[PDB]
Every structure is written in C-alpha cells, then in structure tokens.
C-alpha cells in the first residue's frame, strides 16, 4: 500500500520552525481510512474533495508534520496572517491539499515542560510558501551589531511552547499534518485504490 | 536509569570474563553494551539482550537477568581490554543513560 502510518503514528513529531517534509511516491494511497477515522479533529481540504482523494491520482505527494498549540490551527490555511504563518510555515495562496489536526495532550505534554517543541518568533522577512528556515543566529534588533552573546536587542530567534497537562483547550499540543498534492508533472505514482 | 557497573575487571588471559550492569528492574529494559579502546571511537559490542551484531567475535555474550544484566566474555583473547559501558533508555526520564 502506501506509507502513511509512520507520519500519523510517529512517537515524536517535528517542531514548527524545522517542520519535516516527507516525500511519498510509488504507492497506493488510501485516503479514505484517514477521513473515516474520527480521531482527526480537523480534516479541512482546499481545492479537493475527501472522496476525490482516492478518485483522483497525483504524483510526488509531500507530507509536512509539526505540532502547534490549539488556537493556532486556524493559521494553517492558504491565506492567513500570524507569527507562525509568516515566519515558520506558510501555505501558498493556491494551496491544494488537506490539513489534518488532532489533539495529542496525552503524549507531547510533559508534566514539567520540555524544550522538544519550539517555534520561531523573530524573523526580518516573510517565508515563501513551502520554505523552512532552520538557521539559529542571534537576531539583531537595532543599528548596533550583535556578537554571539545575547542580551539587550539580541534575541534568540526561537521560543519554546509550555506544553503541560494542566493547560486548557487552546494551549494543549495538537499534531498537524499537511498533505501537498503536487500536480502530475511526472507520470502518476501515487494513485488511490 | 541508575546504571552502575564496577570498574574492576582483571580476568586472567584465556579465562572467561564477566561484566555486570547494575540497575533496578533492569530486566524489563534493554541493555546496550559498548566498548571504547583508548584513542578509538566506541563500538557496539551488544545492543539487545544477548543479541550480537555482525562481524564481532563470539566471545562477547550478554545476559540481562531480573535485576543485574551481565556481559560475559568467554575465552578472552590476548589484549582486547578496554572500557565497557552499559546503556539503557528510560521512558520516564526521556533521556538515554550510559551509566559509568
């Protein structure tokens, strides 16, 4: 069949700033079982129908996986504005795919908190669609240049989520998977059942 | 998590060697044994319980008991003495511990 379990059943998940892109090709993709599963809280699809996923075949399908807080799931859309939608992960305005999100408070939330999940807060420009920036350099907040040391006007470009079990809805970790259906430039490789 | 192996092995040449890894309820977890010769990168002598990787001598034999995992090296060849470490994964602590 197609490898989809590893994306939706991995023990660990990538951070927003360093979101992982999994390339999928030469497989029989059964998107129906994903839609059937009630676990996925969000299954919004742009420019495609859930039933048409199996009916229509594509090639070079990509899967982007990352974890964001609950209230930021809205920012994952073709047209949106936010700190994570402009500096961490930006969808193209003509995006054609499904965004899948589900609560994972029982796995990612550590009792005391951890630095496993973190997001980028400072960036001079806006990311282009389907672009990732994993550079970790001291951000410069004024005329005076900054060295390796960080202090006033010298900010580390990453901040860590405070995922804890006590956090209420809207701050608990939510797994997010973005499926990008690339146009059939090449011969079809990822077709439905 | 609290891996503890005594740093005193003086097995006579040719005799069977035994190295013990001390850990609470260590039988449930998987013990990984490593060997590092001086001036050399460490190598994986044993990864799983009594499961050897390819291309190593049969001398190195492991046995993860209920409370004390044991690394047994039978028919010790001349030389082949270095520092041995046992490491496990602690799910509760969420970080690998190499012991000492």
């Amino acid at each position: 069949l197609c490898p989809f379990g590893e994306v939706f059943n991995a023990t660990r998940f990538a951070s927003v700033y360093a979101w992982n892109r999994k390339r999928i090709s030469n497989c029989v993709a059964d998107y129906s079982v994903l839609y059937n599963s009630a676990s996925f809280s969000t299954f919004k699809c742009y420019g495609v129908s859930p039933t048409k996923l199996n009916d229509l075949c594509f090639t070079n399908v990509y899967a982007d996986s990352f974890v964001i807080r609950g209230d930021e799931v809205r920012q994952i859309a073709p047209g949106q504005t936010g700190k994570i939608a402009d500096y961490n992960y930006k969808l193209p305005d003509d995006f054609t795919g499904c965004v899948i999100a589900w609560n994972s408070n029982n796995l990612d939330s550590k009792v005391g908190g951890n630095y496993n999940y973190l997001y980028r807060l400072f960036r001079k420009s806006n990311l282009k669609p389907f672009e990732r920036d994993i550079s970790t350099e001291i951000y410069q907040a004024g005329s005076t240049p900054c060295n390796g040391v960080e202090g006033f006007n010298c900010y580390f470009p990453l901040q860590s989520y405070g995922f804890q079990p006590t956090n209420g809805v809207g701050y608990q970790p939510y797994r997010v998977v973005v499926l990008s259906f690339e146009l059939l430039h090449a011969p079809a490789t990822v077709c439905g059942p | 998590y609290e891996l503890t192996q005594p740093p005193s092995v003086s097995v006579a040449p040719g005799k069977t060697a035994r190295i013990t890894c001390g850990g609470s309820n260590i039988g449930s977890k998987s013990v990984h044994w490593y060997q590092q010769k001086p001036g050399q990168a460490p190598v994986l002598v044993i990864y799983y319980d009594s499961d050897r990787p390819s291309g190593i001598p049969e001398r190195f034999s492991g046995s993860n008991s209920g409370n004390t995992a044991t690394l047994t090296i039978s028919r010790v060849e001349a030389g082949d003495e270095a520092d041995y470490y046992c490491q496990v994964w602690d799910s509760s602590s969420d970080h690998v511990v190499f012991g000492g």
Partner: nanobody
Amino acid sequence: VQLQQSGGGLVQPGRSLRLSCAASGFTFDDYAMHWVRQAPGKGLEWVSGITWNSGTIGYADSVKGRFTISRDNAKNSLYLQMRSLRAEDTALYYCAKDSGRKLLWGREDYYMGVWGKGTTVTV
C-alpha cells in the same frame, strides 16, 4: 558509511558554537542521530538525539535550555547549536547514528551502532 564532523574549536566561556555532522553512505532520513560527548578521562554522556521525522528525542538534564539540535534531511546534515558554554562543556563530541527500527506507537529504544571521529571543544 562515513560521518564527517566540523566546527570544533576553542570557545570563550559564555559564548556560542555550532557543530555540523555531514553524513554519507546510509539513508539519513531513515535513522536517528545522536550527540554524545566524552570528557577527557571520563565516561560517555548522552547530549541530544533526533528521530527520523525531525523529532527531538530529548536533552540531558544539564544541557536542556541551552542546546538546540536540528537536522536537515535534504543535505544529510546534523547540527547542534551550542549556546552559553561553560567549563563542563569541554569534551569530545561524537556524532553517532542509531541503527534501531522506526519508532512508532511508542516503543522507543536506541543503540548507536555507528560512530564517528569527534571534534574537541575547549572552553
């Protein structure tokens, strides 16, 4: 397989450093990478680790809010953004590779089968 390393040098205390570990031979995106540091005349210590899907396994209790580990599967590069170094950080940092199975539904276990020559850092 070969795991070339670079970026090791003397660093003033309180500064920052970046370590890169170029990888070749094996499939970089199908294995978990680990950073292991060894002080001179001391034992091994697990610094950090990232799974196949760019998910940080964790950090050591000492280096938790100072070290950030990232990987780039496109160019098979492993990074460790060391920050606010102290005297204890002075050690030799290997770049090991986990040879375990894909971690799914939990069942997390790590054995660093393949290692590489490390780059010493002096603080």
